[PDB]
Design a protein around this ligand. Structure first.
Ligand SMILES: Cc1c(CC(=O)O)sc2ccc(Cl)cc12
Ligand SMILES: Cc1c(CC(=O)O)sc2ccc(Cl)cc12
Ligand SMILES: Cc1c(CC(=O)O)sc2ccc(Cl)cc12
Ligand SMILES: Cc1c(CC(=O)O)sc2ccc(Cl)cc12
Lengths: 343, 343
């Protein structure tokens, strides 16, 4: 896979990123201890994921830029910007795990739950975010797309934070009000909180590094990418319950967490006064017996069939979007993402 | 005062800032509820302080720019950038109050302690930070100092976060180890965590808006400003204990909070094996009787006299620094700050 082969040079470049970010201590030994803390925060939270977002920057870069213009320095910058996307990701996860009181992440203990960390992780999360801009300055300061990348990253943070606000207001920890779990709210949350930084950002970054800064080109890529993000989250919600932990590599808990899942949203549109009550009395409960009661209602409403029907329509629509908005970009850029996301 | 008269037009401009930041909802009603939350976060956390940092941007701007170049739009931008400094301040305070479990701030209940907020304040704090860059883009996008201000603000956040890291590592909530309360550590913490964004940032911003972007000019202003910041914190620590709540407008708790105060740092350099024990057995305790025991030790070591002697030397040094590094800037810029800080 384009990601499998490149993943090696990606994860290997992290060592250099850490070195560069923790080398401003050579001239300021006074902050030495802080810099050492920063290194630990970086190694624990930026490593261990799949790097889908970061690698996307590298893969797209190689398809938008001519093979000869891909010199050592240009690729070095691509890997760096890819790692910037991963730090943004690390920033969000550390903060998010705190806000929803999670216990584990990527299998390991959430950073803030580690002995001696606690709420100090709030400052660690902000440092991760800050590192993004330090890397951009250190590697792209002289590039014509410098300001474009800074604003793209700042914009992605704002969008994601607005989305998190929406998500917090929608599922308040202490209010099992399924009334606000509408389809419009769900789509808005996905769009701002996940789609923008997970799919648009990586592609948009590569585009700017390739010299493609056209407002229309970015607008068309966004049209396609935000739709892929929407399908990504919907499939992710579906797999959380009906997926196989052996394959997916994770155990679903959206039901016990009272999450505003696509499943519950659909279940709310396809439910009778009596079916709704069962849902309103078994959603957000730790009892395995109550959770299974929700899964039963879902199948009873043939949601798995609804998802399948949605996956088919979504695939058709995406291919249509690619056929209409891909140009002047290589369709393979978007097709490669689709193939990764769709099954 | 230059601040008293200008403060009116400053606090009045906040209404416009809120309007502009909460008007992107006119075209995206989907995030309406999030935008309403943002407005509430802004009005509660950016208002109520003294606005010393923000006003400094406005006052300095009027002294670095010619009276005729101060048109309606230029002043509008100065007020906006001044409000950006205040949002950065609001971002830090909201986060800091959470990390150290504070109960009140500026007399009122800390935002996160408000019913229905809690840890969600972590995302609110990040939104405040994000607003800075939205304002800069909305008001200075076309200005030649645009990128300079973005980087200055990004750099101020990084510096302050590194300083907070240092401060967290120095006084861990659960380790009354006075061994790490050294003078070098104290000065490093003050410099990164407070001096850079509180004194350098405001002046540096006005400088760039005035067209003064010289690396040497900024380096000289920093030399002076960081020294003023150092004196500011030291005087603030001294007043926390020996100050009069009626005048200062706040009750000291550094002793009960086990803070790495300038006082304790001095007390640690001027203490005998027996005096140290008393300190090590009465610092960080809520008991009013133990706190008074610390204050007694301080006076016993004539710290108030030490502070007075330090204020005199600091004043002389600052005036020397101003006489040597002020140019080509108007000395009144720095003199005005000194007069505000020194008594
Ligand atoms: C993504 C996709 C297809 C494209 C492919 O061959 O990979 S055929 C098909 C049928 C059902 C569903 Cl649910 C998805 C797909
Ligand atoms: C599966 C996936 C994401 C979800 C994640 O890995 O956390 S972000 C992203 C971006 C591009 C591609 Cl191709 C896949 C993905
Ligand atoms: C700041 C300052 C002076 C300058 C002034 O007149 O305001 S004279 C003086 C004496 C003692 C101390 Cl502690 C400070 C000062
Ligand atoms: C007293 C003071 C600060 C402390 C605070 O108001 O929180 S930041 C600052 C910047 C410039 C001037 Cl002139 C004074 C101050």
């Amino acid at each position: 896979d384009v990601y499998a082969q490149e993943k090696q040079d990606f994860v290997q470049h992290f060592s250099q990123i850490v070195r560069v970010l923790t080398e401003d201590e050579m001239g300021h030994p006074e902050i030495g201890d802080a810099i050492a803390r920063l290194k630990e925060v970086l190694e624990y939270n930026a490593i261990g994921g799949k790097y889908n977002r970061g690698l996307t920057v590298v893969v797209a870069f190689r398809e938008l830029v001519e093979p000869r213009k891909q010199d050592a320095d240009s690729l070095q910058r691509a890997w760096t910007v890819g790692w910037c996307v991963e730090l943004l990701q690390a920033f969000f996860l550390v903060a998010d795990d705190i806000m929803d009181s999670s216990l584990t992440r990527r299998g390991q203990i959430c950073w803030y739950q580690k002995p001696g960390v606690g709420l100090d992780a709030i400052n660690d999360a902000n440092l991760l975010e800050a590192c993004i801009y330090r890397l951009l300055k250190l590697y792209c300061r002289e590039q014509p797309y410098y300001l474009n990348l800074i604003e793209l990253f700042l914009q992605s943070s704002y969008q994601t934070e607005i989305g998190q606000t929406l998500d917090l207001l929608t599922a308040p920890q202490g209010n099992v009000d399924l009334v606000r779990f509408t389809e419009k709210r769900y789509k808005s949350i996905v769009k701002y909180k996940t789609a923008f930084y997970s799919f648009y950002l990586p592609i948009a970054a590569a585009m700017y590094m390739a010299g493609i800064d056209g407002e229309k080109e970015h607008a068309n890529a966004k049209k396609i990418l935000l739709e892929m993000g929407e399908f990504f989250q919907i499939q992710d919600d579906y797999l959380d319950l009906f997926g196989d932990p052996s394959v997916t590599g994770k155990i679903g808990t959206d039901i016990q967490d009272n999450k505003c899942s696509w499943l519950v949203v659909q279940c709310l549109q396809r439910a009778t006064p009596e079916q709704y009550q069962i849902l309103k009395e078994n959603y957000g409960q730790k009892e395995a017996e109550k959770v299974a009661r929700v899964k039963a209602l879902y199948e009873e409403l043939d949601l798995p069939a609804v998802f399948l029907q949605y996956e088919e329509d979504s695939y058709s629509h995406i291919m249509a979007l690619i056929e209409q908005y891909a140009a002047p970009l290589p369709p393979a850029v978007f097709l490669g993402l689709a193939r990764k996301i769709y099954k």
